[PDB]
């Protein structure tokens, strides 16, 4: 019976992967290290660094913890530190959804918030308020998990013994995706260490980070990647740094909790690709030892979700079954019935109408056709844009009371309201917005700005 | 004590023109003849036509009048109508009004609407349902005010012996805007015929008409202008044609009513201008006698509002004072303070991003700004359009994951907060949009869309 | 040839009603006063009063006149005034409506406004802020159109000679409707000094009147009724003070409009309807004058219109055809096709789902019917309302956390959707709210709320 | 190295409770169950009933599971199933959340929905169509986890030995939670037969179960309590039955979470309550081990959310600080600035216009207060509802044309602007509204609807 729910941190089994690993090529077994009691691998790194800094006489008992954390090794360290009764201060940016900030909160945290994106060497950021916030307050350690050896030294005592009783030293390649400089590093001296040279130690990084050797970038699978260099991961244990793109962090995260049964996150995925990427270089005989760092349930709606996975340019395929089975009629809708409102302005109606026609409706595109019973053939007059008029009405190459019957673009094209998006998706690819003949009479214009709009919602 | 109200049809006054009419020319004396029965000069013609077909036998009593009519004529014709209790069925384009259905309406009579803009001589238009009517409903009587020649005789009968006997013979000149071929044709007939050959008849027309020597055209003026030639319409009656534009039309009836106490309509400013325009060509010792054939307490809401005249480019100024006094800071409300809500994009969120809070918020520009408290400085990065965006997407030039500080147009030019709108509206002449400086600071951008929509509305 | 439009005021037409009066009874003829250039019969006074403030040495040329006028007078006095220039300030409660204002203003007067129904005593409604106007500015002349005997002394010198020199003599009774005396005394006064005492002055009134002998009330015929004595009004001149309704007086205000040819406001029709009540008295070979004060242009919104009449208990009958020709089954589509939404709470889902489901769907009652399918008979297991669970949640009778099959009010009533309103009236005159079934099925639910709202717009 | 995830299914830690347990009472440890692959201890009994159903012949190679699982089972059969490659397809009730099917899709299931709240044997429950996909696609194979003795079998043979062996037989009492009968039927026979008798298995169940000793209900803890007897259910294992509240549920999950850092569900702290509620009629030398069956982070939005928990009578305090420091005046904004609108209807407007105004303005009861400007002191003459209205214009008590000051009711109530919501909702368990004054001037009307409107989402 243990003292605490904080005794449980460590030992995490070591499965196998059986149906991701292409045939012809070594084993690859993936430590899964999402069953710690603190749902993350960061758990093991905040009990080590809460230990220390107790035991180095920097944390007296009664202290009050702040560190500017993201919302997973926040976790761990409010579990670790609520153990034994320490108030636990942290810092996030708005880039963390509220489901995030709710767990950290029910764990007897208190976390306070500043705006995201903002400069980080300002005292805007959350960098600034949390040193502020340890200045301040007494008593308060600020683990700075960035620049603090304790996390690699934690992955150095209890992650790279493990690794190594668990598979009795036969184990040539360690794959684990590198954000803070941790796991790599520890993991990396210890394989080194006690195996003489055997061990190759590979490292996972999405594409176009300071580790892989590129520039910034806006990143998505949280946890990895980085803009600088932690004072905490020396660059020199690992030895082939690869590199990955975000596509294929999601594919593959998403493939392995398809065909593996393991719902991990980004990083996960993200550490998969390389190791499989690894599992080339090496015929059999070989043992790749994965490390799958997080658990893949906060991530139900980015990357297990169907609209986040299109809001960008992801979503190879739909999550269960057939590939769109959407058309561009029901694009249309917004309303599940709302196309009975062919927007159209007569060649005779002046170009103020045409221009409030435009903004009663909200839309920005209109087929002016004549014979006003909107079950008219192809016999479209032409099209009146909002850009043009607007453009023309203001430089003076047409005046309000004129009509549109001499200020209208050539007619626009025209695709089937019966077809999936994917051929709208490359139609809008050569113009701006198409009309949709459905039995040859036109119901509505498809524009980019919709196909967005829909697309990133459903 | 007159036997019914359609009797005092006729023997309208004959006011003389004061102070719109400049010096050092002929008295220009204006026939107002909205002050009959049925409010306009087009009663005179309704009253003739029916007591010729009650008299010839062509509408037996208990018929049913049936005209595509403008509405104007329209009151005419139920008035005298149910004098006796003839049926009327009026067929109006939509283009009408509702308080003009409602006038027609509450007169005892039934009006069947059409659309417009419509080819005139399809199966939708008010000509073909018009003669439908007339031929199926027995006892049908088309008037066809366009091609009878009793509105001629009628004008003729009861329109030039009131003007040569109200001035004793001395006038000289006899201008009236001519749309059906009406008051002028029989006038001048008449003016002629008993002047020998001094009063030559003059004729104003909206500028692009048939009459006036151009082509088709979208009328404003009500009543006025013609597509075609009308067959009651002697063409050699007339003798100096004069072209009359619609601000100018606008403008005089306006100030017709500001400094003659007349609220006369479209076509009474009209014929108004164009005998000032030949109270030129002729000096002292001449009388000019326009006709000021209708009313302006329908247009109260067109020609009178401060709208629909700056919907277009007419509105030269203000009924009740200053110009403008409505600045840019006041154009950026629409809801009198709706602008604690200035869209700004960082230059490190995604291209995603900034295209979802450009249409969360319903607009379609904002400035890439650092420092997202909107309270920064004219330091901003950017601008990152809407168009662009999903161009720069669409075509392959960038992806939906890329950072938008590698997509983003330069900054959009700015002004002042407290300026005139007319400043605004020629500053947008040359850029599509542009931020608005309060202090230095940023607040909104305005954009011609924009503009104009405040113009029509306020 | 007159000098100015200001000259045509007076000797109006007096014509007879034809098909209104009853058969077996006297004469009525209709003293019709709305062809006067000014629109009404108000603009005798004005001129009057123009007269006599500018020839006593009242009002020095150069000065501005001021008056708490209504729109009815301003149009009058402004006509009057801006004939030789004199520049004119109003004051308007909040009650009159954009174009009469609009009309006030195209002669050029200056309209300034003040919140209506505001105590008229304070220094807030338009008499204390008129009163402070005439006090500062110089040169003003409030005529006070309340206690100037120039009213009377105008319609006694102008409207009582014409009312006697067009019939001879041979007019028994005068009847005309009274708000403010100027009328009924001056015709009253003259009409009884010249002819001895044949003629009898009767005087109409809204039902509940000074006048008339009664208490306070809102008024909505514009023009006639008071709440206290003016000055300008002798109680002795009239003889019988006739009552009548709003009703009646809208009523018989269309159907003069519908079988005279006149387009008659609400005054000519309470006037009319107190002379078809006079003309009772007495037998044949009488004469009736009535005056009718006012052209029904300006009520095309009010009376002519079709919710405005409804929006009151008025509308006896539509205004030119069905009674309604309108189904319950209408009222539930407030989009035209918007009732596939049965709202329903099956008895097992929590109380607080039903609140929630009520104010998430706007409405405030729904039936409990299991079977989801929205196709069920009357079948239904009861009715939840929303002030009963929000009354049975804050009294302490039923906990959020219950189920709603506990808490429901017994079914409520039901009515076909396919008949009209009157019916639906009828029914809900004796509960709160009824479904609506259809074929059997309940498709929506019409509450009193819902069914006024609707025959308050169309 | 395991050789599939599915292995790791057993040997779950023993944790003891320290903060939550009063003291003067035996040692309170709960064997956690959310350190197991699939999430919860509903994943045990899954293993089972793969190995038996594939041992004894009775889901041939190549078959499909089927069953109306809740969502917690479900994801255990898809993992174990998809170690082999069975197919899934799960039968659910809406009731379910969104992420919870995605969850189950993630892991290669096909989940078909059905309604919820409808008879549980009709042709749209999931039963009846789990039924019908079990007869009709061949290989099928519905477990029936509430009917098949695998599920008790299992948790006999790999649940109680656990209990037994990490405690070396020193257990006295085992309290779990007992919906369909698995735990206490398996985890008690065994501790039962191997300790004597001394082993009394305690039993949870939430208030208004089956098993209580009660009638049916609608549940919020989602797991436990049923409103029938599962065949897999003996009734004579358990020997003391705890019935506990949900409210007292969720409280103790969240305390629990607090302070012994695990984020269990609903369940895990009924459990625990009734745990402690059996650790006071035993002394010390007592050890009673709990059952905590679940993991509580799809939970994280309906038991460690706040407006869920205070969308019924839950919610006692917030996670993370003071009580509420939320005022009425913070109610009525809507918008953090929406009451500049202070709705009013002076005592002379129609009835007609205050229940228009009511209507346009979204309220439903306003204040009838003369000087309209809303900055007036107590001075109000009174209040009208829109009930009484749209009672009193139907029921023939009032005309729609009549003033207001003849049928409002007295003045409503009022009270202060910066006061805890809880003192206003005690304030409207008398009254339907009450007005919020501040400093005086009254500013809204806060009702029983707005205030439970605002508590259910903020």
């Given at each position: 019976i243990?003292?605490?729910?904080?005794?449980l941190?460590?030992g995490?089994?070591?499965v196998?992967?059986?149906?991701v690993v292409?045939?012809?090529?070594?084993?690859?077994?993936?430590?899964?290290?999402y069953?710690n009691?603190?749902?993350?691998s960061?758990?093991?790194?905040?009990?080590?660094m809460?230990?220390?800094?107790?035991?180095?006489?920097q944390?007296k008992?009664?202290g009050?913890?702040?560190?500017?954390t993201?919302?997973?090794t926040?976790?761990?360290?409010?579990?670790?530190?609520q153990?034994?009764?320490?108030?636990?201060?942290?810092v996030?940016?708005?880039?963390?959804?509220?489901?995030k900030?709710?767990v950290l909160?029910?764990?007897?945290?208190?976390?306070?918030?500043?705006?995201?994106?903002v400069?980080?060497?300002?005292?805007?950021?959350?960098?600034?308020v949390?040193?502020?916030?340890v200045?301040?307050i007494?008593?308060?350690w600020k683990?700075?998990?960035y620049?603090?050896?304790?996390?690699?030294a934690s992955h150095?005592?209890?992650?790279?013994?493990?690794?190594?009783?668990?598979?009795?030293?036969?184990?040539?390649?360690?794959?684990?995706?590198?954000?803070?400089?941790?796991?790599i590093?520890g993991?990396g001296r210890?394989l080194?260490?006690?195996?003489?040279?055997?061990?190759?130690?590979?490292?996972?990084?999405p594409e176009?980070?300071v580790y892989?050797?590129?520039?910034?970038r806006?990143?998505?699978?949280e946890?990895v990647?980085?803009?600088?260099?932690p004072?905490?991961?020396?660059?020199?244990?690992?030895?082939?740094?690869?590199?990955?793109?975000?596509?294929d962090?999601?594919?593959?995260?998403?493939?392995?909790?398809?065909?593996?049964?393991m719902?991990?996150?980004?990083?996960?995925?993200?550490?998969?690709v390389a190791?499989?990427?690894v599992?080339?270089?090496?015929?059999?005989?070989?043992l790749?030892?994965?490390?799958?760092?997080?658990?893949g349930?906060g991530?139900?709606?980015?990357?297990?979700?169907?609209?986040?996975?299109?809001?960008?340019?992801?979503?190879?395929?739909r999550?269960?079954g057939?590939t769109?089975?959407?058309?561009?009629?029901?694009?249309?809708?917004?309303?599940?019935?709302?196309?009975?409102?062919?927007?159209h302005?007569?060649?005779?109606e002046?170009?103020?109408?045409?221009?409030?026609?435009?903004?009663?409706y909200?839309?920005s595109?209109?087929?002016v056709?004549g014979?006003?019973?909107?079950?008219?053939?192809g016999?479209?007059?032409?099209?009146?844009?909002?850009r043009?008029?607007?453009?023309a009405?203001?430089?003076?190459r047409?005046?309000?009371?004129?009509?549109?019957s001499?200020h209208?673009?050539?007619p626009?094209?025209?695709?089937?309201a019966?077809?999936?998006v994917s051929?709208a998706?490359?139609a809008?690819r050569?113009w701006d917005?198409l009309?949709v003949?459905?039995?040859?009479?036109?119901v509505?214009?498809?524009?980019?700005?919709?196909?967005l709009?829909?697309?990133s919602?459903?």
């Open positions: 243990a003292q605490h729910i904080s005794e941190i460590g995490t089994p070591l196998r992967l059986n149906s292409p045939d012809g090529a070594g084993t690859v077994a993936a430590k899964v290290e069953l009691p603190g749902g993350s960061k758990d093991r790194i905040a009990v080590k809460i230990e220390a800094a107790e035991a180095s006489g944390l008992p009664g009050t913890i702040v560190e500017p993201s919302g997973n926040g976790v761990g360290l409010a579990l670790v530190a153990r034994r009764g320490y108030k636990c201060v942290f996030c940016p708005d880039k963390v959804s509220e489901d900030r709710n909160i029910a764990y007897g945290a208190e976390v306070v918030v500043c705006p995201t994106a400069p980080p060497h300002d005292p805007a950021s959350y960098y600034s949390s040193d502020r916030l200045r301040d007494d008593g308060a683990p700075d998990q620049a603090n050896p304790e996390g690699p150095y005592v209890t992650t790279g013994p493990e690794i190594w009783a668990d598979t009795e030293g036969k184990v040539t390649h360690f794959v684990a995706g590198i954000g803070t400089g941790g796991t590093t993991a210890y080194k260490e006690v195996s003489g040279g055997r061990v190759r130690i590979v490292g996972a990084d176009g980070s892989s050797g590129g520039a910034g806006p990143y998505l699978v946890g990647g980085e803009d600088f260099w004072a905490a991961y020396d660059p020199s244990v690992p030895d082939e740094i690869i590199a990955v793109s975000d596509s962090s999601f594919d593959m995260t998403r493939r392995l909790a398809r065909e593996e049964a719902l991990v996150g980004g990083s996960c995925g993200m550490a998969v190791a499989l990427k599992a080339e270089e090496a015929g059999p005989d070989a790749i030892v994965v490390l799958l760092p997080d658990g349930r991530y139900m709606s980015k990357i297990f979700n169907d609209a986040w996975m299109s809001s960008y340019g992801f979503l190879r395929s999550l269960d057939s769109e089975q959407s058309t561009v009629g029901d694009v249309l809708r917004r309303k599940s019935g709302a196309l009975p409102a062919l927007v302005t007569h060649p005779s002046t170009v103020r109408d045409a221009i409030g026609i435009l903004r009663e909200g839309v595109q209109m087929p056709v014979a006003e019973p909107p079950v008219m053939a016999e479209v007059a032409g099209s009146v844009s909002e043009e008029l607007l453009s009405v203001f430089e003076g047409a005046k309000l009371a004129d009509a549109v001499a209208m673009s050539p626009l094209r025209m695709i089937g019966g077809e999936l051929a998706g490359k809008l050569d917005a009309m003949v459905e039995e040859g009479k036109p509505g214009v498809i524009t980019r700005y919709d196909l709009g829909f697309l919602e459903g």
